[PDB]
Amino acid sequence: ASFRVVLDPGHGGIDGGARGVTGILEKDVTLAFARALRDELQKGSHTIVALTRDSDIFLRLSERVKKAQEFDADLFISIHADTIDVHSLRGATVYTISDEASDAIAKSLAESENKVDLLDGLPKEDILLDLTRRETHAFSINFANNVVSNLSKSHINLINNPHRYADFQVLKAPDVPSVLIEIGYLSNKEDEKLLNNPQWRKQMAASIAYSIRQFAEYRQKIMQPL
Amino acid sequence: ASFRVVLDPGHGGIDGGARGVTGILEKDVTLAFARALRDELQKGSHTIVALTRDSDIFLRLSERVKKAQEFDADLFISIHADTIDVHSLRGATVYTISDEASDAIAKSLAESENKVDLLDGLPKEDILLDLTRRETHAFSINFANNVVSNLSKSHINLINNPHRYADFQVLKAPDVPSVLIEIGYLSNKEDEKLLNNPQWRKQMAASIAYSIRQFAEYRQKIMQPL
Ligand SMILES: [Zn+2]
Ligand SMILES: [Zn+2]
Numbered sequence: 001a002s003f004r005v006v007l008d009p010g011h012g013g014i015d016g017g018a019r020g021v022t023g024i025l026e027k028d029v030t031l032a033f034a035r036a037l038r039d040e041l042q043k044g045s046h047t048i049v050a051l052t053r054d055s056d057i058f059l060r061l062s063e064r065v066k067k068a069q070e071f072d073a074d075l076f077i078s079i080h081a082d083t084i085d086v087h088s089l090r091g092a093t094v095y096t097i098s099d100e101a102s103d104a105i106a107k108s109l110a111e112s113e114n115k116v117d118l119l120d121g122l123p124k125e126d127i128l129l130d131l132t133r134r135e136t137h138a139f140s141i142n143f144a145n146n147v148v149s150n151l152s153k154s155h156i157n158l159i160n161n162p163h164r165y166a167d168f169q170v171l172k173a174p175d176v177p178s179v180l181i182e183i184g185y186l187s188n189k190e191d192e193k194l195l196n197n198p199q200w201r202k203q204m205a206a207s208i209a210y211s212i213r214q215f216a217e218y219r220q221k222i223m224q225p226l
Numbered sequence: 227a228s229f230r231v232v233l234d235p236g237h238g239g240i241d242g243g244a245r246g247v248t249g250i251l252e253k254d255v256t257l258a259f260a261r262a263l264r265d266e267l268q269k270g271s272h273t274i275v276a277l278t279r280d281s282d283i284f285l286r287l288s289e290r291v292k293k294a295q296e297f298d299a300d301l302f303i304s305i306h307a308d309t310i311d312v313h314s315l316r317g318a319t320v321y322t323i324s325d326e327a328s329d330a331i332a333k334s335l336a337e338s339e340n341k342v343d344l345l346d347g348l349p350k351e352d353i354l355l356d357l358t359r360r361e362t363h364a365f366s367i368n369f370a371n372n373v374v375s376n377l378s379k380s381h382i383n384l385i386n387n388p389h390r391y392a393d394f395q396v397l398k399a400p401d402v403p404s405v406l407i408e409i410g411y412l413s414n415k416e417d418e419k420l421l422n423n424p425q426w427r428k429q430m431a432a433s434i435a436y437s438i439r440q441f442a443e444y445r446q447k448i449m450q451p452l
Contacts, residue, residue, distance in 0.1 A: 098449065128353070131354070131357050134451050218371065222367055225360050
């Protein structure tokens with residue numbers, strides 16, 4: 001069966017996201033990275049990919065989640081390259097959702113990343129469900145773990161404690177495993193140099209694509225009892 | 227939190243299980259292995275272990291499952307060293323439950339292993355539930371995968387296609403992740419030599435204990451939304 005993946009290039013349109021010292025914008029880096037990851041996935045077999053946006057447009061976080069659900073996604077990956085409070089912090093990071101943040105950096109990052117909805121100048125927006133949520137979370141965690149493992153094997157630099165968590169609204173799908181990947185932090189000058197290198201970006205995308213293939217193979221082993 | 231594991235030494239009492247050429251009995255090997263795995267787990271931190279039997283007694287498969295549930299187990303491992311139809315087949319194997327067998331060897335093995343209940347000479351014995359079952363199965367699969375991965379890293383010999391599946395009644399807990407591990411096959415002369423070596427058994431138990439620790443760390447990352 002074809003495994004279904006939705007990629008969400010963070011920011012877009014009026015929301016440029018973080019800005020590097022060279023002028024490079026997060027919204028452009030995330031779209032370029034998403035396109036590279038799509039390409040890597042499409043080189044493989046049995047993965048069908050869609051992007052929340054494949055152009056420079058603004059989308060509310062809830063609309064990104066809705067697109068993943070409308071696609072019947074098996075996995076949702078939101079792609080970012082943010083500024084964080086400490087400029088010395090650098091390296092790939094994977095975040096999953098949690099009410100309680102793993103640490104102060106993660107907490108502050110989610111607070112800021114959730115607020116971008118307001119940039120359009122418009123206002124802010126069951127047991128069976130809770131069980132589904134728990135199952136989804138197990139999958140999100142599994143994927144995050146695998147991504148970190150394979151990035152490490154590929155000698156791609158990871159931040160200390162590279163699996164973190166906080167209350168990211170873009171990760172709220174109750175029924176689609178979801179992670180947010182910081183490919184690097186535009187607040188760090190060394191990460192900015194990696195982020196603007198398309199060959200480095202391709203190498204990271206290739207590692208994530210491998211992780212996705214492994215996750216697909218795992219998911220397809222699981223029973224369907226309904 | 228203390229991760230809760232129930233180990234099930236296959237067979238027991240009137241059911242000797244498979245018999246090696248040296249006279250060694252499966253029921254004795256599985257109890258010895260379970261005790262070694264208990265010891266390895268108890269050397270670690272944060273694992274609480276119980277055995278379905280810690281003596282030479284016969285237990286129906288349903289009673290083994292009930293004991294896992296009564297203990298509020300987070301993981302159930304049934305330990306075996308069976309005879310299979312092809313004597314040239316050897317190596318550690320992990321089985322998970324499925325209505326449809328992975329292959330003819332797995333199918334025949336489950337048929338035979340389910341029939342042991344009859345050795346006492348007595349007769350043979352919901353959406354929310356189905357969802358719980360699906361979640362449990364994801365965990366069973368995850369653990370099986372990790373066990374195979376770590377056995378390989380430890381240079382412990384694995385059978386070809388070392389993750390298999392069939393309709394094993396001892397793996398029927400809807401709410402406890404469950405696997406059946408063949409530590410080797412007493413139908414194979416080389417496996418018999420490994421099986422009777424307590425140092426080799428200890429090395430395999432140590433690898434499984436490591437896999438359990440990794441599984442515990444994973445399980446404890448997952449949300450509790452109820
Ligand atoms: Zn961002
Ligand atoms: Zn057996």
